[PDB]
Design a protein around this motif. Structure first.
Motif, PDB file in Angstrom:
ATOM      1  N   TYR A  69      58.883  34.461  44.039  1.00  0.00           N
ATOM      2  CA  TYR A  69      57.999  33.634  43.247  1.00  0.00           C
ATOM      3  C   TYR A  69      58.298  33.800  41.761  1.00  0.00           C
ATOM      4  O   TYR A  69      58.664  34.889  41.299  1.00  0.00           O
ATOM      5  CB  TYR A  69      56.552  34.020  43.559  1.00  0.00           C
ATOM      6  CG  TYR A  69      55.534  33.255  42.763  1.00  0.00           C
ATOM      7  CD1 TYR A  69      55.108  32.000  43.168  1.00  0.00           C
ATOM      8  CD2 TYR A  69      54.992  33.792  41.600  1.00  0.00           C
ATOM      9  CE1 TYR A  69      54.172  31.291  42.424  1.00  0.00           C
ATOM     10  CE2 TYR A  69      54.064  33.098  40.861  1.00  0.00           C
ATOM     11  CZ  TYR A  69      53.647  31.847  41.284  1.00  0.00           C
ATOM     12  OH  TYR A  69      52.719  31.154  40.543  1.00  0.00           O
ATOM     13  N   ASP A  71      56.570  33.127  37.958  1.00  0.00           N
ATOM     14  CA  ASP A  71      55.262  32.918  37.348  1.00  0.00           C
ATOM     15  C   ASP A  71      55.291  31.703  36.436  1.00  0.00           C
ATOM     16  O   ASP A  71      56.090  31.636  35.494  1.00  0.00           O
ATOM     17  CB  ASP A  71      54.818  34.138  36.555  1.00  0.00           C
ATOM     18  CG  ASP A  71      53.350  34.043  36.121  1.00  0.00           C
ATOM     19  OD1 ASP A  71      53.012  33.197  35.253  1.00  0.00           O
ATOM     20  OD2 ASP A  71      52.535  34.812  36.666  1.00  0.00           O
ATOM     21  N   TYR A 121      56.622  41.598  45.394  1.00  0.00           N
ATOM     22  CA  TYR A 121      56.950  40.185  45.581  1.00  0.00           C
ATOM     23  C   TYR A 121      57.862  39.630  44.487  1.00  0.00           C
ATOM     24  O   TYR A 121      58.267  38.470  44.577  1.00  0.00           O
ATOM     25  CB  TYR A 121      55.667  39.326  45.647  1.00  0.00           C
ATOM     26  CG  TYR A 121      54.998  39.156  44.287  1.00  0.00           C
ATOM     27  CD1 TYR A 121      55.395  38.143  43.418  1.00  0.00           C
ATOM     28  CD2 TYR A 121      53.989  40.026  43.865  1.00  0.00           C
ATOM     29  CE1 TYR A 121      54.827  38.005  42.165  1.00  0.00           C
ATOM     30  CE2 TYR A 121      53.411  39.886  42.613  1.00  0.00           C
ATOM     31  CZ  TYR A 121      53.840  38.873  41.772  1.00  0.00           C
ATOM     32  OH  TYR A 121      53.285  38.708  40.532  1.00  0.00           O
ATOM     33  N   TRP A 283      51.932  32.935  48.705  1.00  0.00           N
ATOM     34  CA  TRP A 283      50.588  33.327  48.301  1.00  0.00           C
ATOM     35  C   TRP A 283      49.533  32.823  49.275  1.00  0.00           C
ATOM     36  O   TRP A 283      48.433  33.373  49.312  1.00  0.00           O
ATOM     37  CB  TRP A 283      50.283  32.856  46.873  1.00  0.00           C
ATOM     38  CG  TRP A 283      51.102  33.590  45.823  1.00  0.00           C
ATOM     39  CD1 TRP A 283      52.226  33.131  45.181  1.00  0.00           C
ATOM     40  CD2 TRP A 283      50.880  34.927  45.329  1.00  0.00           C
ATOM     41  NE1 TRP A 283      52.704  34.091  44.318  1.00  0.00           N
ATOM     42  CE2 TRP A 283      51.902  35.201  44.388  1.00  0.00           C
ATOM     43  CE3 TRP A 283      49.921  35.913  45.589  1.00  0.00           C
ATOM     44  CZ2 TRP A 283      51.981  36.416  43.699  1.00  0.00           C
ATOM     45  CZ3 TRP A 283      50.008  37.127  44.905  1.00  0.00           C
ATOM     46  CH2 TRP A 283      51.028  37.361  43.971  1.00  0.00           C
ATOM     47  N   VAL A 291      42.432  39.493  43.169  1.00  0.00           N
ATOM     48  CA  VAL A 291      43.458  39.879  42.217  1.00  0.00           C
ATOM     49  C   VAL A 291      44.029  41.204  42.697  1.00  0.00           C
ATOM     50  O   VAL A 291      43.411  41.921  43.491  1.00  0.00           O
ATOM     51  CB  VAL A 291      42.941  39.981  40.771  1.00  0.00           C
ATOM     52  CG1 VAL A 291      42.411  38.635  40.289  1.00  0.00           C
ATOM     53  CG2 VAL A 291      41.885  41.078  40.643  1.00  0.00           C
ATOM     54  N   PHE A 292      45.245  41.505  42.246  1.00  0.00           N
ATOM     55  CA  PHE A 292      45.913  42.765  42.585  1.00  0.00           C
ATOM     56  C   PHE A 292      46.084  42.917  44.098  1.00  0.00           C
ATOM     57  O   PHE A 292      45.956  44.012  44.644  1.00  0.00           O
ATOM     58  CB  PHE A 292      45.152  43.961  41.994  1.00  0.00           C
ATOM     59  CG  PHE A 292      46.047  45.043  41.427  1.00  0.00           C
ATOM     60  CD1 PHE A 292      47.175  45.481  42.123  1.00  0.00           C
ATOM     61  CD2 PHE A 292      45.767  45.609  40.188  1.00  0.00           C
ATOM     62  CE1 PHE A 292      48.005  46.469  41.589  1.00  0.00           C
ATOM     63  CE2 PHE A 292      46.571  46.603  39.660  1.00  0.00           C
ATOM     64  CZ  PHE A 292      47.696  47.031  40.354  1.00  0.00           C
ATOM     65  N   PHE A 294      48.834  41.479  47.311  1.00  0.00           N
ATOM     66  CA  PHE A 294      50.141  40.859  47.481  1.00  0.00           C
ATOM     67  C   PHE A 294      50.429  40.707  48.969  1.00  0.00           C
ATOM     68  O   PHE A 294      50.075  41.583  49.764  1.00  0.00           O
ATOM     69  CB  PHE A 294      51.217  41.697  46.770  1.00  0.00           C
ATOM     70  CG  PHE A 294      50.798  42.191  45.402  1.00  0.00           C
ATOM     71  CD1 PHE A 294      50.695  41.325  44.332  1.00  0.00           C
ATOM     72  CD2 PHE A 294      50.507  43.528  45.191  1.00  0.00           C
ATOM     73  CE1 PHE A 294      50.321  41.778  43.071  1.00  0.00           C
ATOM     74  CE2 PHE A 294      50.117  43.990  43.928  1.00  0.00           C
ATOM     75  CZ  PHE A 294      50.027  43.116  42.876  1.00  0.00           C
ATOM     76  N   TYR A 334      45.090  42.888  32.531  1.00  0.00           N
ATOM     77  CA  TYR A 334      46.089  41.863  32.787  1.00  0.00           C
ATOM     78  C   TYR A 334      45.774  41.064  34.053  1.00  0.00           C
ATOM     79  O   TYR A 334      45.889  39.831  34.071  1.00  0.00           O
ATOM     80  CB  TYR A 334      47.440  42.578  32.862  1.00  0.00           C
ATOM     81  CG  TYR A 334      48.515  41.966  33.712  1.00  0.00           C
ATOM     82  CD1 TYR A 334      49.052  40.743  33.423  1.00  0.00           C
ATOM     83  CD2 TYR A 334      48.992  42.634  34.811  1.00  0.00           C
ATOM     84  CE1 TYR A 334      50.049  40.195  34.211  1.00  0.00           C
ATOM     85  CE2 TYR A 334      49.977  42.095  35.608  1.00  0.00           C
ATOM     86  CZ  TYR A 334      50.502  40.875  35.304  1.00  0.00           C
ATOM     87  OH  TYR A 334      51.500  40.328  36.085  1.00  0.00           O
ATOM     88  N   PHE A 335      45.323  41.736  35.107  1.00  0.00           N
ATOM     89  CA  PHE A 335      45.020  41.039  36.351  1.00  0.00           C
ATOM     90  C   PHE A 335      43.793  40.130  36.278  1.00  0.00           C
ATOM     91  O   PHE A 335      43.613  39.309  37.180  1.00  0.00           O
ATOM     92  CB  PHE A 335      44.842  42.067  37.454  1.00  0.00           C
ATOM     93  CG  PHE A 335      46.040  42.938  37.631  1.00  0.00           C
ATOM     94  CD1 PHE A 335      47.046  42.568  38.502  1.00  0.00           C
ATOM     95  CD2 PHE A 335      46.196  44.094  36.874  1.00  0.00           C
ATOM     96  CE1 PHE A 335      48.179  43.352  38.652  1.00  0.00           C
ATOM     97  CE2 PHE A 335      47.335  44.880  37.014  1.00  0.00           C
ATOM     98  CZ  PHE A 335      48.322  44.508  37.913  1.00  0.00           C
ATOM     99  N   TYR A 338      44.210  36.282  36.332  1.00  0.00           N
ATOM    100  CA  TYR A 338      44.760  35.709  37.546  1.00  0.00           C
ATOM    101  C   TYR A 338      43.696  35.448  38.603  1.00  0.00           C
ATOM    102  O   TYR A 338      44.012  35.432  39.794  1.00  0.00           O
ATOM    103  CB  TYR A 338      45.864  36.609  38.111  1.00  0.00           C
ATOM    104  CG  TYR A 338      47.130  36.462  37.329  1.00  0.00           C
ATOM    105  CD1 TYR A 338      48.076  35.512  37.677  1.00  0.00           C
ATOM    106  CD2 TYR A 338      47.356  37.234  36.198  1.00  0.00           C
ATOM    107  CE1 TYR A 338      49.250  35.359  36.935  1.00  0.00           C
ATOM    108  CE2 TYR A 338      48.511  37.087  35.448  1.00  0.00           C
ATOM    109  CZ  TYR A 338      49.453  36.145  35.823  1.00  0.00           C
ATOM    110  OH  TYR A 338      50.590  36.006  35.070  1.00  0.00           O
TER     111      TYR A 338
END
Ligand SMILES: NC(=O)c1cc[n+](CCCn2ccnc2/C=N/O)cc1
Ligand SMILES: NC(=O)c1cc[n+](CCCn2ccnc2/C=N/O)cc1
Lengths: 540, 540
Positions: A69, A71, A121, A283, A291-292, A294, A334-335, A338
């Motif tokens: 993937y 971003d 990922y 996804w 979030v966080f 995978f 940061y997460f 998302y």
């Protein structure tokens, strides 16, 4: 003609490239093949060693990035693009890189081996932020980094099956470690002194190699930056791995309508799909908005890991091991952009109480309502329960403590109590050049550029103090790789970095100021995550 | 130099370029500026005419694409990337293109003016699928196409304010039509015979120009392909427009807390943001989960439209107008992979009943439960209420009828009953090269490549019959542009295309077979959407 750019290894001959730094040149061998290309019938299978070649393989540039993937949440934005592929995608991606000082060392030299993160990922050894030239020039170590398969290609698992056993990305890393054992001497590197370091999912990987007997003999020290194998995101169960693989198959038309769906037929159908088609549906197999989390991660199946990382960490004897572990100041921030409601990188993210309460369910997915209430209880300031700035910082703490700080504190204490010498840090300097907003603080991943000495790049705009700071950190990391101890064997003046112990829980802050000794890695919050919250789930 | 690649227009001189086709050359003038660059303080403002220039402007290549979201749902996939920008993004994007026959016509020639679609948030006149060379060579028409501002830059609206009045993208299109009036004769074009054609949001645009008196004198005929100005997605109300502009402002930190609030301060703060920052938050202002809805579209504010398109269509006098309108066979299918649960372009999308019922709420957003129940009643086959394939086709019908077919049929009947001569078609040929899955049929947009004659491109792999078919379609469109009548001016051999009438409702199928006459554009379904469901919403 520089002969130092020519080297022979067990498989054949190589030509490297000379890299400049302000302190002098370095020799680099970029793109060495260490596995047969894992394509066609080899998709999802353990890697196979690269058969020897005739002639001189060109090792002057990085090879392809493994399919993954990309971003697109913020096109053109440095803060995300710095992690995206910077070479073409290919399933033909099992290559590794070696930086060695110039002149080549004559005496065997300690080896640092970098495993990149990217949530299992994404990621690539070729990213500009992993440029090994400044570390090798400044500390005259040997540096190795490898690509390993990510996403479904590295970690899709139908447990039990021969066709998609799981964990093949971890085997890619192991194969590369076996490669370092057999060939690093040809570069002046000491295979009896190999220190793994890694960040985020690379830290989880380093930890998984600690807990896997076949890998444990290939290295001698370990550095785990902002990650651990016992993270709630780092492993997945056989049943859930099989469900994810089966849904991925369904989303790409596998198996064709009216055809059996046993493991052989499923993987065979999966092996006919273009790689990008697999990437495009990755996804969509996560069980819930999160979030966080995978989709394709290491699976606990009894093979690569004989038991869960938690079980293996508790029962383990780590005598003879030295470990350096640490976290950044703001692991969670940061997460939040998302998926947490009300968050935006382009405003102040001053969320409401309702947004905070919804965010807790996104940041702590798959837990009962009573568990979420317990999270809200611990993380609300009850004197300012609706102050948006405190709620923003609090949800950042929820995600960071749950996913990084408390899995790491857990691991660090069990290691120290069971035989290992452990050193711990919290990284608190925010790059002067950071492009994420100020409210995110020191986000996940933003110590890396200082560990690799990127501030020394003359084309960048770091401050003079950040260059000195970067040199300090590279010395710490190299001291640890050489001696097992980040402290200078020659400076009793400079303040010391004491070991981390399950009792005193001491750790140092890394920033522009001299080392400062603190105690407890968020001990109160981690007691909630590590001690209370599990009991809460048992009594549902 | 060839003499006819040099042309003078009111603002200055141009150099064009010669384009090859299998039938002979064409002269193209690509990237003519028609407005001052709407940058800086001009962002969100109506366009200003391009001031005249010295020297020769190079008109040999397409200019920049207006800033817009870039589709990443399927990286590398031809089906989506054919619509993505194929030149760099810039706010400096108000350029138009003129294709003209070689040799240049000596008597005035009818003008076709293309307005692209893209839901008012995307699109460019430079896309390969809008290559005007084959239409101009084959039918010796003049063809113009313009870029116009999309997304927030074209349609963010704080109603009332002078700083962001809305609809400026429609004003861009009008300025381009004024330019054709003043300059197209210089290319051999006849400003007294201008036919607008457009697809999807471009068809809605063509319709808006019919209903706006300042635009209506700039042209004489209209072709609306798969779109109408009365579509539920094509316009937005003043309050909802203000809400969306204000949330966009919030998402990008406007106004800086807590200073600011009024429209002057909001727009001034928006004008300081990098364009890409606005693009990156565009989708986050839509009121709910939906397909076929777009954030920044024409606003009904009393200016460009003195009343809703529905009101103006019902009251209008359309004597003297000829219109061509039509739809593709599967208007809805494309949109279902952008949100409807259970859909995927890479499988058969055989949805369950549950998925169909959830899909109805996504495809018909912001309606009462009772309204959704009415939709389910009309679209279930009660002998097969759970058959996945019938349900897949039914949700496609729901989205296509609601958004395209029934708004078009509605417009077509009101126009014909109120003085216009109207012709109607359904496009039923699925390109041999179409990259979308077979279950999508003839999706939204996939007649465009036949209307522009793209099958004649020798570098493409269309069949011999598709080339003949393309030529037949270009004849119809040009005939309609010349005479107001798609029918061959004298040819009695070819089957006839009868006008569409509010009584007989006759239309033709366009496919490889000769024309076939049919009656009723989904008459029963459109009676549900146009007549009953409104009454069902009135009594909540
Ligand atoms: N739903 C989507 O379309 C989607 C978009 C981006 N992503 C990227 C996830 C990034 N991420 C989230 C939590 N942690 C990370 C990355 N860590 O490196 C995932 C899914
Ligand atoms: N930011 C996002 O995750 C996002 C959401 C929706 N979209 C919508 C894609 C385009 N689309 C949806 C329905 N119809 C269209 C295109 N019409 O031309 C794009 C991106």
């Amino acid at each position: 003609e520089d002969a130092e750019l020519l080297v022979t290894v067990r498989g054949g001959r190589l030509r490297g490239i000379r890299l400049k730094t302000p302190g002098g040149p370095v020799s680099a061998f970029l793109g060495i093949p260490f596995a047969e290309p894992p394509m066609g019938p080899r998709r999802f299978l353990p890697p196979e060693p690269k058969q020897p070649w005739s002639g001189v393989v060109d090792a002057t540039t990085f090879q392809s990035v493994c399919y993954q993937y990309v971003d697109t949440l913020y096109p053109g934005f440095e803060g995300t693009e710095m992690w995206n592929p910077n070479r073409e995608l290919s399933e033909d991606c099992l290559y590794l890189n070696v930086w060695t000082p110039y002149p080549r060392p004559t005496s065997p030299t300690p080896v640092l081996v970098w495993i990149y993160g990217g949530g299992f990922y994404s990621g690539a050894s070729s990213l500009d932020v992993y440029d090994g030239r400044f570390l090798v020039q400044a500390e005259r170590t040997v540096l190795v980094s490898m690509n390993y398969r990510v996403g479904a290609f590295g970690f899709l698992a139908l447990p039990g099956s021969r066709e998609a056993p799981g964990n093949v990305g971890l085997l890619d890393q192991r194969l590369a470690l076996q490669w370092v054992q057999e060939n690093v001497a040809a570069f002046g590197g000491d295979p009896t002194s190999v220190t793994l370091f890694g960040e985020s999912a690379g830290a989880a990987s380093v930890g998984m190699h600690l807990l896997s007997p076949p890998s444990r003999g290939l290295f001698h020290r370990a550095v785990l930056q902002s990650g651990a194998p016992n993270g709630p995101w780092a492993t997945v169960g056989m049943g859930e791995a099989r469900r994810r693989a089966t849904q991925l198959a369904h989303l790409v038309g596998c198996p064709p309508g009216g055809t059996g769906g046993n493991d052989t037929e499923l993987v065979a159908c999966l092996r006919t799909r273009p790689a990008q088609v697999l990437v495009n549906h990755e996804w969509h197999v996560l069980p819930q908005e999160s979030v966080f989390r995978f989709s394709f991660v290491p699976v606990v199946d009894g093979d690569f890991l004989s038991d869960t990382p938690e079980a293996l960490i508790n029962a383990g004897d780590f005598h003879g091991l030295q470990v350096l572990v640490g976290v950044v100041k703001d692991e969670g921030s940061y997460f939040l952009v998302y998926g947490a409601p009300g968050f935006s990188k382009d405003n102040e993210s001053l969320i409401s109480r309702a947004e905070f309460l919804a965010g807790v369910r996104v940041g702590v997915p798959q837990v009962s309502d009573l568990a979420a209430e317990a999270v809200v209880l611990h993380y609300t300031d009850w004197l300012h329960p609706e102050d948006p700035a405190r709620l923003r910082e609090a949800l950042s703490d929820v995600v960071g403590d749950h996913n990084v700080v408390c899995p790491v504190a857990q691991l660090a204490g069990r290691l120290a109590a069971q035989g290992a010498r452990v050193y711990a840090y919290v990284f608190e300097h925010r790059a002067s050049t950071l492009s994420w907003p100020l409210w995110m603080g020191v986000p996940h991943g933003y110590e890396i550029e200082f560990i690799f000495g990127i501030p020394l790049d003359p084309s960048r705009n770091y401050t003079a103090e950040e260059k000195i700071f970067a040199q300090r950190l590279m010395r710490y990391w190299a001291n640890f790789a050489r001696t097992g101890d980040p402290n200078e064997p020659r400076d009793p003046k400079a303040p010391q970095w004491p070991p981390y112990t399950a009792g005193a829980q001491q750790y140092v802050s890394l920033d522009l100021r001299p080392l400062e000794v603190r105690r407890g890695l968020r001990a109160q919050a981690c007691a909630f995550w590590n001690r209370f919250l599990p009991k809460l789930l048992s009594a549902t």
